Design a protein around this ligand. Structure first.
Ligand SMILES: Nc1ncnc2c1ncn2[C@@H]1O[C@H](COP(=O)(O)OP(=O)(O)OP(O)(O)=S)[C@@H](O)[C@H]1O
Lengths: 191, 275, 191, 190, 191, 83, 95, 95
């Protein structure tokens, strides 16, 4: 069960969940596999925080193993649209989609824990049906692959040609190596 | 008009008025002019301070001293001091609901009873109120990917904030239209005219360009705050630069002043001549 | 779980669910495959908003990957008889039902994000039984496909023959392509 | 999960479910396959609304895909029993039982959305057992079939022989076409 | 999901579920197959109402397709034991167990909807195992059938021999026929 | 209520005559089942007293001391004749 | 009538009556239409105001050593000032 | 107590005050200044997150509530004081 935390508000004591209390501090946790329903919650959280105080920056702690690419795009599109800088702090693990969101964070606010491990690979999708349907369905997969390389390369800063070869197969980048690659500005070794 | 005709109950108060919109919607102006036109002393009590048990006691209680028995209810004695004086209330939304209930009592019976035993008659006083609920809701932005106007009807806010019986006893809900930009331009001229007459006594002559008045109008006046910031904006912008020169500089004698703005940098340029 | 969000009011502090607070601002979220159960919730939300304030417009995000033909029409039908304009900002992904609902939004209010993918395919259904029953069922289900083209033609503005050719097989449209085809309009993207 | 929508009252603010808030406005929502538990919920809602205000009419949104025939009859009888007219609104697919509730709605207030479809078919069920047992069950469904056609014909006003012909074979009717049959008085312009 | 309803009181608004609000007016609801858990709830509701007002009558709405005989006996015993006269209204359909409870209603307060269907038949309880055990179990089931037939005969008023003949096989019965048979005093007439 | 209004006007010197049909219309709108006769005082106050007061200060009532109350069937709104 | 005749309660009030009926049916008016006819003072207290526990101290006054000791009870002052009068309590249930 | 604010209000607007003797005091020459400690209140606690977030107190929230609006409006300027910077603190060491 989620623990309950009490906030020492002057008007009266306020009861909150651990996630809700942290959300009041513009902290959002991207935990679990990427999905349409879970992604919707993150979008709703970002919208609420931006309206409450667009001047303050929003934080995103990514500890997800990846998932559906389409669901993740909603988070990516909303991250740039909202005025608050979407800080991305990779924690524990960053898969292809999780890594994509990590780079999406505002420049200068992207961080990785000292022992955090990142993984980047090409989207995996398959379709079954008539030959004509597979060709058109397959074409969209390749088209999407180009789109991810373009957006990832822009934030990372790596050349498009290098991204294709690296993205062809799974690439595990340790936290120091991620800074070299350009995924994160620096590592939060200690306070 | 109803009270003057006399086709009404004697106990019922002379008039019931209401005001809505941002702070500084001419509540003081119309009330002061209305009081002047009716030849009744203007009495104004601010509900903004009535937010605590000690402060809310002030209406019928004697905050100055418990030993003091002459003052009694400060709001109540005010009516007693001047029978025809108008009562101006502002920011009533803040006040507790319990305090607002006593207002309903006097409105119905047109009479009040002080703790000390004094009886006050409301048959000769007009009661007006001011509400600023609109600014809080409209300034807020909708929680959506694309923003939307958050303006709401003033009458809607009166209904939610106040109990239904208050509106029923109230003769009508009066909503004052919002300020217009033309009035703001005239307001800027009035302040300059006020400053102008003040300078003429010292012997200093100030001339202001028409473009300068418009420039101050855009940044100074605010929709949420009405014309209150424009007043303050005119004081710091004009009094501060001349003040240094008046003590020592070109304006010590002659007092030739010119006011103009530069379109390229969009900043006011002040020209001082020794004269 | 849904994090709680505190909205400050003159009366006092109030707590609402993240979805509930967004609904208070006339924001409706459509997620997952459309169905009778979820569609009724969206229909219920729209009816409540109309009664609360018919003057103000409603918003409807679309992240569904598909749905049920019957369920989707219920949401579309509701939009027609309610005075508030139902904005349709597609988030993440659109499909046969999502695109129909997305284009259904009032002209000028419909929008789509840059990375959102809008898929439009003809309705597909399977039925078995007696030969007489299949024949009557086949003509009626085919009629629904024709109805979709006629309704789609109105919003898109293209001829029913053009939409039928494009919708004969699965079609994937990019966000710029979708705007050019009349399905949606570009977002302001100004802050 | 379902959103919680607050209400505005003089005493204060009360939180309500989206379904409960609409119920305050005499609006009932029907969805999913008809069931004994589901049918009891609609029946309880109708009875409560009748007691609250008999003069004020009630509204019902039917999106049923069909269900138990017996469960649906409870809603029909309760609908006829209650004094307020039930404004049945077909917002989605309506099966034989769902369509019957639509037709059961008080004449003069029935409505159907322009794109919504209404399917009518004969009641169908399967029973396995001894030759004697199937005949008993066959008579019940045959008797019920006549009752459904007779009651549907009464509300619609169509000939009982003609409706039975259409009912035996699975058929779909568009909202404009439904008006001709008489299932719904008229479509909603807006 | 059950909708909530507010009832006005001098002190203030009171929120109760739809089932509880109707229970306040002495209207009990019986739904689904009879069982120990649901029967426990029904008897609990009857006892509570008896204490609140013994003079007022209890209204049980039977919409069950049949259930275990043992659980039903508890409801039958409680209904007869409590001083308040229970009025059983058959909603939708009444099976062997539902019909038995419906007949148990106090004379003069039993009703059947015009479209309701009442089905009465012998118990279908069975047991398997050693021949000795089946013989003891076989003897017990006859006693329940004899006891059930005798109890049904008393309320309906038919002879014991007649009830046995009707319950030898499934006997579906219409609502108007029930009045002639004597299961219910009279049909409920709509306004 | 009309008698009270008529008595008040009589002291001022104005005579009021209200049509019998007009009284029936006022009764339905003024009286509410839930609120009983509570709104009848407000309806009579706003509808009748406010228009008459305007003429009393200046108009036909100040010069002639006569007033009449009528109902408009097409508009279903009370019409007052001042003389 | 019995009170004037000498058959009224020696220590209890002249009469205690509770009017339970729809609002606006004249329950309140009977009280104000009897005082004018009898030519006696009318004492009316708004029970709705006395909706909290602290409010009861207002009618009887605060005890010695408190802020409200100086101010006498509202109910006691009114009845002492007007021994013969009609006491009207409205919305008693909300009290 | 707020009673003093009335004396300051009269002193500020009229520019003179009368004591028991009734002599008139000239406040035009004197310059009136006050020091309030409402601004000391600050949110010392840092954000609940890996990265600390700056917190800004509402401008004059406590000052607005504690003082009356008419008195506050009369004040020409409610001067504020910012926290001493690290570089500024070095200068203080020399003093
Ligand atoms: N039988 C009656 N004859 C004449 N007037 C009546 C009668 N019954 C009720 N009224 C009127 O109904 C109005 C309200 O009745 P009350 O019993 O005083 O209720 P109330 O809720 O206290 O009313 P307010 O003070 O107007 S909110 C008054 O104008 C009464 O004179």
């Amino acid at each position: 069960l989620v623990p309950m935390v009490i906030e020492q508000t002057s008007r009266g004591e306020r009861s909150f969940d651990i996630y809700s209390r942290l959300l009041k501090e513009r902290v959002i946790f991207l935990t679990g596999q990427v999905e349409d329903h879970m992604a919707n919650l993150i979008v709703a959280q970002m919208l609420f925080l931006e309206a409450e105080n667009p001047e303050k920056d929003i934080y995103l702690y990514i500890n997800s193993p990846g998932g559906v690419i389409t669901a993740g795009m909603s988070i990516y599109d909303t991250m740039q649209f909202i005025k608050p800088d979407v800080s991305t702090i990779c924690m524990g693990q960053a898969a292809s989609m999780g890594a994509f969101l990590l780079t999406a964070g505002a420049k200068g606010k992207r961080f990785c824990l000292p022992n955090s491990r990142v993984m980047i690979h090409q989207p995996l999708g398959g379709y079954q049906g008539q030959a004509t349907d597979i060709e058109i369905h397959a074409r969209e997969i390749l088209k999407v692959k180009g789109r991810m390389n373009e957006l990832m390369a822009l934030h990372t800063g790596q050349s498009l040609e290098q991204i294709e070869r690296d993205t062809e197969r799974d690439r595990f980048l340790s936290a120091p190596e991620a800074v070299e690659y350009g995924l994160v500005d620096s590592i939060l070794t200690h306070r | 008009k109803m009270a003057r005709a006399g086709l009404g109950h004697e106990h019922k108060p002379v008039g019931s008025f209401l005001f809505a919109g941002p702070t500084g919607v001419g509540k003081t102006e119309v009330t002061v002019q209305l009081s002047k036109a009716l030849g009744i002393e203007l009495l104004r009590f601010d509900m903004s301070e009535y937010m605590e048990r000690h402060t809310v006691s002030r209406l019928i209680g004697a905050p100055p001293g418990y030993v003091g028995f002459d003052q009694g209810g400060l709001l109540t004695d005010a009516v007693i001091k001047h029978p025809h004086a108008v009562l101006l209330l502002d920011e009533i939304e803040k006040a507790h609901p319990d305090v607002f209930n006593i207002l309903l009592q006097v409105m119905d019976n047109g009479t009040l009873t002080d703790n000390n035993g004094r009886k006050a008659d409301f048959r000769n006083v007009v009661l007006v109120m001011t509400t600023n609920a609109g600014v809080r809701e409209t300034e807020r932005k909708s929680i959506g990917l694309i923003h939307q106007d958050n303006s709401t009807d003033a009458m809607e806010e009166i209904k939610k904030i106040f109990t239904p019986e208050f509106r029923n006893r109230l003769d009508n809900i009066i909503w004052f239209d919002h300020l217009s930009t033309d009035v703001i331009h005239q307001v800027v001229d009035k302040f300059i005219v006020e400053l102008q007459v003040q300078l003429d006594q010292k012997g200093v002559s100030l001339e202001v360009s028409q473009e300068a008045r418009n420039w101050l109008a855009e940044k100074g006046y605010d929709r949420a705050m009405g014309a209150r910031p424009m007043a303050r904006v005119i004081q710091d912008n004009l009094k501060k630069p001349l003040a240094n020169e008046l003590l020592f500089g070109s304006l010590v004698d002659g007092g030739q002043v010119t006011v103009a703005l530069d379109k390229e940098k969009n900043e006011l340029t002040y020209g001082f001549q020794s004269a």
